[model samples]
Target: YSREKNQPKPSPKRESGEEFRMEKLNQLWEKAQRLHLPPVRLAELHADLKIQERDELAWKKLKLDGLDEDGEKEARLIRNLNVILAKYGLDGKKDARQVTSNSLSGTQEDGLDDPRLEKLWHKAKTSGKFSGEELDKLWREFLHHKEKVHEYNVLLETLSRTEEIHENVISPSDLSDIKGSVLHSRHTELKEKLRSINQGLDRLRRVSHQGYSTEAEFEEPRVIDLWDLAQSANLTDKELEAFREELKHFEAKIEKHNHYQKQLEIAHEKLRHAESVGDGERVSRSREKHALLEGRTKELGYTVKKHLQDLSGRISRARHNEL
Candidate 1:
């Protein structure tokens, strides 16, 4: 959709206080723009103003500008929510301007100088495995996962710090005067309320770092595009049965390969840690194990590729004979 599509067409008639109110709103909008406030923050502000119904231009501009701005936390949250929305073929943007802006500006760095995401984007760009839309979709999905880890860290940091309780508490011994003494009961109540809040906060710490999962993350496969013609193939019943058995065998082999790859990754991690500790013997052992694991993985990969190629030829020949 285009930016103008979601934008409220300008009003035909000026209502009461339209000029004065818009002037003030426009000024705040300009200042927020100057600060380069992130889109999520802008959406937060837009929600606060409750102007989407009455002030279309203001809401539209605020939404667009906020999205265009790049703050680390803001970018992370927006990227994550957008990714989640995208799976359902939806985006959080109301206007085409938002999409165009994001596309033109490219993905924003988290401002932490982390190369992990950059590497992902680079790999996607160079691999030629995905279309522009598909690549963006995959990137958003990855960002969503990364955002969960980020949120976990944030919650951990939040739980580690304690808030000062001076405002909510007053020691009876500190107030000797009668006026203060008369308010002792009120102070006690306030102290109790503060105690409850602190207790809640303490409990929150237990679950604060808990990660969230969505239904989309665990969705079952609903369609088989490539295998739709499995039964339509020009092959004898015996050959069809053999093909099915071989396909299952291939699946098992792939699973085994995946298991070994995971093992290799673990071994590599161990080697890194061993090196970091400067334990020469441990480093040597880990290096050897990692090397062996990599060699096995490569060997298994070649085997799988060769078997698949042979299986494809067999299936083609069966189909050719049937035809």
Candidate 2:
């Protein structure tokens, strides 16, 4: 059977205002670009957005060379973005765009630098294995994931060996191996979602810092706003809306991640129960599952580190006003 290729994807909607309309999908596409997912996903959304910009440009080229010069184009982009941000409860706000050196330490050094802003900064620091509290929690999740994938690989290998041993008969062990593989795939999905969530949270915290306050004292930690240092990057409504849409996507993935993690936990509990009951055959099957799970755990560890490094790369590239 051909593998089913279609996965659940984001819905399309046009976010518009003051008597205007657009495709919902197009709106979401623009939103995703503004927030910046992985470069690959960002590129896809950007490509689709280019078409709209092109269409608008084609009709306006006779009047001007740039979209903003005509004013209508820039206005439309701003309006659409405002609609999106307002939908997500972040409307009518501008990015913080100033730098300040406080004469006294006061609240800035005390961490009263906007609770929302601090939360974002701290969240990014703690998410995945980036900081203390999350480090071991992340490791545990990684361990479970590794165990699942390793079991899956072992099962496949066992099935192959069994086929070699018996020309026409597949053993019960082989059947167990197949069953284990199914669970292993689910485990991998959970791990991927976890990584995605970690990255999302990391980004969210950084953006929040850039969004919630307007003081360099509160901003220096986040790379995206090195220029403003203490205020929202003064991103346009469109940019804010785009970031919100990305958050929504991250939330969905987190839910899926939690669900899958539960599944793995349940399976683990079952295996432990089998061992306590002295079910030799069942225990052997559990062993297979554990192998895959261990493999996934190791993989998760590497991925978490890799993802953070990638985010750090984005920081290295960002431009801003001088401190």
Cα RMSDs, all models: 29.3, 33.0
Least accurate stretch of 10 residues (summed lDDT) in model 1?
A: 217-226
Candidate 1 residue-wise lDDT, 145-202, digit = tens: 4554344434433322212225564335443334443335444544565555556444
* Best candidate (score: lDDT): 1
TM-score of each: 0.28, 0.22
Instruction: Tell me how far the alpha carbon of residue 232 in candidate 1 is from the true structure, in angstroms, after superposition.
Output: 5.8
The lDDT of each candidate is 0.52, 0.49
- How well does candidate 2 score on lDDT at residue 186? 43
Model 1 per-residue lDDT at 284: 72
